[PDB]
Design a protein around this motif. Structure first.
Motif, PDB file in Angstrom:
ATOM      1  N   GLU A 137      55.032 -11.848  -0.976  1.00  8.47           N
ATOM      2  CA  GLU A 137      55.689 -10.612  -1.440  1.00  8.47           C
ATOM      3  C   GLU A 137      54.949  -9.326  -1.002  1.00  8.47           C
ATOM      4  N   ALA A 138      54.134  -9.402   0.058  1.00 10.88           N
ATOM      5  CA  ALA A 138      53.441  -8.227   0.563  1.00 10.88           C
ATOM      6  C   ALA A 138      54.447  -7.221   1.071  1.00 10.88           C
ATOM      7  N   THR A 139      54.157  -5.951   0.852  1.00  8.27           N
ATOM      8  CA  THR A 139      55.042  -4.908   1.340  1.00  8.27           C
ATOM      9  C   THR A 139      54.681  -4.412   2.730  1.00  8.27           C
ATOM     10  N   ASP A 140      53.422  -4.595   3.137  1.00 10.36           N
ATOM     11  CA  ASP A 140      52.950  -4.337   4.499  1.00 10.36           C
ATOM     12  C   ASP A 140      52.366  -5.623   5.072  1.00 10.36           C
ATOM     13  N   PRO A 141      53.214  -6.621   5.386  1.00  7.93           N
ATOM     14  CA  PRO A 141      52.688  -7.936   5.787  1.00  7.93           C
ATOM     15  C   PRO A 141      51.985  -7.954   7.140  1.00  7.93           C
ATOM     16  N   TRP A 142      52.371  -7.101   8.091  1.00  8.44           N
ATOM     17  CA  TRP A 142      51.769  -7.178   9.430  1.00  8.44           C
ATOM     18  C   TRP A 142      50.385  -6.543   9.522  1.00  8.44           C
ATOM     19  N   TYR A 143      49.923  -5.839   8.477  1.00  8.21           N
ATOM     20  CA  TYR A 143      48.691  -5.055   8.539  1.00  8.21           C
ATOM     21  C   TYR A 143      47.815  -5.158   7.305  1.00  8.21           C
ATOM     22  N   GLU A 144      48.341  -5.549   6.146  1.00  7.88           N
ATOM     23  CA  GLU A 144      47.477  -5.679   4.971  1.00  7.88           C
ATOM     24  C   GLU A 144      46.292  -6.616   5.241  1.00  7.88           C
ATOM     25  N   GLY A 145      46.517  -7.709   5.963  1.00 10.78           N
ATOM     26  CA  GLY A 145      45.415  -8.608   6.214  1.00 10.78           C
ATOM     27  C   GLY A 145      44.353  -8.067   7.147  1.00 10.78           C
ATOM     28  N   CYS A 146      44.597  -6.902   7.767  1.00  6.35           N
ATOM     29  CA  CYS A 146      43.675  -6.272   8.716  1.00  6.35           C
ATOM     30  C   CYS A 146      42.701  -5.305   8.050  1.00  6.35           C
ATOM     31  N   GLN A 147      42.834  -5.067   6.757  1.00  7.59           N
ATOM     32  CA  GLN A 147      41.981  -4.115   6.080  1.00  7.59           C
ATOM     33  C   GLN A 147      40.525  -4.533   6.124  1.00  7.59           C
ATOM     34  N   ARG A 148      39.657  -3.536   5.994  1.00  3.81           N
ATOM     35  CA  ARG A 148      38.226  -3.765   5.945  1.00  3.81           C
ATOM     36  C   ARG A 148      37.829  -4.612   4.734  1.00  3.81           C
ATOM     37  N   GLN A 149      36.649  -5.180   4.819  1.00  9.42           N
ATOM     38  CA  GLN A 149      36.262  -6.222   3.868  1.00  9.42           C
ATOM     39  C   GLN A 149      36.174  -5.704   2.434  1.00  9.42           C
ATOM     40  N   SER A 150      35.644  -4.489   2.244  1.00  7.48           N
ATOM     41  CA  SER A 150      35.523  -3.896   0.919  1.00  7.48           C
ATOM     42  C   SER A 150      36.851  -3.831   0.198  1.00  7.48           C
ATOM     43  N   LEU A 151      37.972  -4.044   0.904  1.00  3.76           N
ATOM     44  CA  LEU A 151      39.274  -4.078   0.258  1.00  3.76           C
ATOM     45  C   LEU A 151      39.812  -5.491   0.088  1.00  3.76           C
ATOM     46  N   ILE A 152      39.120  -6.520   0.580  1.00  7.61           N
ATOM     47  CA  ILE A 152      39.685  -7.868   0.515  1.00  7.61           C
ATOM     48  C   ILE A 152      38.737  -8.804  -0.225  1.00  7.61           C
ATOM     49  N   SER A 153      39.213  -9.339  -1.337  1.00  9.44           N
ATOM     50  CA  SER A 153      38.418 -10.276  -2.138  1.00  9.44           C
ATOM     51  C   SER A 153      38.161 -11.592  -1.396  1.00  9.44           C
ATOM     52  N   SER A 154      39.223 -12.267  -0.941  1.00  7.57           N
ATOM     53  CA  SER A 154      39.048 -13.401  -0.037  1.00  7.57           C
ATOM     54  C   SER A 154      40.320 -13.622   0.769  1.00  7.57           C
ATOM     55  N   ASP A 155      40.143 -14.383   1.841  1.00  7.82           N
ATOM     56  CA  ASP A 155      41.230 -14.665   2.758  1.00  7.82           C
ATOM     57  C   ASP A 155      42.318 -15.524   2.147  1.00  7.82           C
ATOM     58  N   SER A 156      42.082 -16.116   0.971  1.00  7.39           N
ATOM     59  CA  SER A 156      42.929 -17.211   0.503  1.00  7.39           C
ATOM     60  C   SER A 156      44.360 -16.755   0.269  1.00  7.39           C
ATOM     61  N   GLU A 185      50.801 -17.005   4.237  1.00  8.23           N
ATOM     62  CA  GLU A 185      52.168 -17.079   4.758  1.00  8.23           C
ATOM     63  C   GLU A 185      52.247 -16.597   6.206  1.00  8.23           C
ATOM     64  N   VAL A 186      52.448 -17.545   7.132  1.00  7.14           N
ATOM     65  CA  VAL A 186      52.863 -17.216   8.489  1.00  7.14           C
ATOM     66  C   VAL A 186      54.198 -16.498   8.441  1.00  7.14           C
ATOM     67  N   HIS A 187      54.289 -15.317   9.071  1.00 10.31           N
ATOM     68  CA  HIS A 187      55.546 -14.560   9.034  1.00 10.31           C
ATOM     69  C   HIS A 187      56.736 -15.434   9.401  1.00 10.31           C
ATOM     70  N   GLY A 188      57.896 -15.056   8.861  1.00 10.04           N
ATOM     71  CA  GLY A 188      59.118 -15.746   9.217  1.00 10.04           C
ATOM     72  C   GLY A 188      59.464 -15.589  10.683  1.00 10.04           C
ATOM     73  N   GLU A 189      59.272 -14.399  11.235  1.00 15.03           N
ATOM     74  CA  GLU A 189      59.866 -14.272  12.553  1.00 15.03           C
ATOM     75  C   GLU A 189      59.093 -15.047  13.615  1.00 15.03           C
ATOM     76  N   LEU A 190      57.904 -15.538  13.280  1.00 19.09           N
ATOM     77  CA  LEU A 190      57.105 -16.318  14.214  1.00 19.09           C
ATOM     78  C   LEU A 190      57.585 -17.756  14.317  1.00 19.09           C
ATOM     79  N   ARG A 191      58.250 -18.264  13.283  1.00 21.95           N
ATOM     80  CA  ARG A 191      58.367 -19.707  13.129  1.00 21.95           C
ATOM     81  C   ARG A 191      59.149 -20.371  14.261  1.00 21.95           C
ATOM     82  N   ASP A 192      59.968 -19.612  15.002  1.00 27.56           N
ATOM     83  CA  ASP A 192      60.722 -20.166  16.120  1.00 27.56           C
ATOM     84  C   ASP A 192      60.163 -19.753  17.482  1.00 27.56           C
ATOM     85  N   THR A 193      58.932 -19.252  17.535  1.00 24.91           N
ATOM     86  CA  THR A 193      58.306 -18.881  18.797  1.00 24.91           C
ATOM     87  C   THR A 193      57.193 -19.864  19.128  1.00 24.91           C
TER      88      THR A 193
END
Ligand SMILES: [Fe+3]
Ligand SMILES: [Fe+3]
Lengths: 168, 168
Positions: free
Chosen positions: B43-62, B66-74
């Protein structure tokens, strides 16, 4: 060897203060590897920059023989007095923050005196598989950059060296 | 050890063209290391970039499961389907030409799949005094970036990797 130390017994803080003051009067040119020529050809019209070079086509070092007259009254002139050899084409070579070289081989090895550095500034020898740090300890380091290698500066400050050539 | 190879059998040219295609609709962000998130939090609102934030903003990778939907057929979706682990916080990580980062320790080691690279891209492990190259050979390279390390790209092109996290 890849690297050898010659003790010059230069004071690193006084050498730094000296180099910092010089750069306020004679700024480094270029980006990536920033440069200032500390030796010039006799009777040069552009003594501070003519010896600076970074194009792919290297010119000969042999005629850049004259330490600039105004270094004589500086601590930086004392480094030249203590050299065990006659330098040629001596330059300040400053790696920008976050910058690195291609993995490549140089035609000629040079002597490095680290003025300002950090634990993020290293030479990387690819075949020898060694990583090498030149400390700002006021001593002279021969570095064999004919060996396949790169150098990088991963820090946020410039890594400033003085880099001496020699013929013999 | 610092590194391990798992043969994944990915075709390097389809991977490359699949990445170049993706990036034309979803550009890399940032300057030194340029990034795109390939997994997102539910349910991320910025799925393509939220995971790119600096570490001080991310508790853990866990959370980044979710692999994006549009990738699943590529082809990329097919790369995801061949991992031996379940991946988390997968990103495209591209080093800029002539760029390198600080000598540091990552919180978390990751798996690198090289997309475009050259002989000028290397990892440097300071304490182990090893230099390592990750080839665009279709295979997954675990790299223990918890070890004191830098990496550099001395080439003229971006060095594009896919970097995968895992929990086990
Ligand atoms: Fe003197
Ligand atoms: Fe080694």
């Amino acid at each position: 060897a890849l690297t050898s130390r010659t003790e010059l017994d230069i004071d690193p803080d006084k050498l730094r203060e000296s180099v910092v003051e010089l750069l306020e009067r004679h700024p480094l040119v270029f980006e990536g590897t920033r440069q200032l020529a500390l030796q010039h050809r006799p009777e040069a019209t552009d003594p501070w920059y003519e010896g600076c070079q970074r194009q792919s086509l290297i010119s000969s070092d042999s005629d850049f023989t004259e330490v600039h007259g105004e270094l004589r009254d500086t601590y930086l002139g004392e480094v030249f007095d203590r050299l065990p050899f006659k330098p040629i084409r001596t330059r300040i070579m400053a790696l920008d923050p976050k910058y690195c070289y291609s993995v490549h081989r140089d035609l000629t090895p040079r002597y490095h005196l680290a003025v300002t550095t950090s634990e993020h500034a290293r030479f990387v020898f690819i075949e020898h598989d060694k990583v090498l740090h030149i400390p700002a300890d006021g001593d002279l380091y021969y570095v064999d950059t004919r060996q396949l290698h790169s150098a990088f500066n991963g820090g946020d400050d410039m890594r400033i060296h003085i880099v001496f050539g020699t013929d013999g």
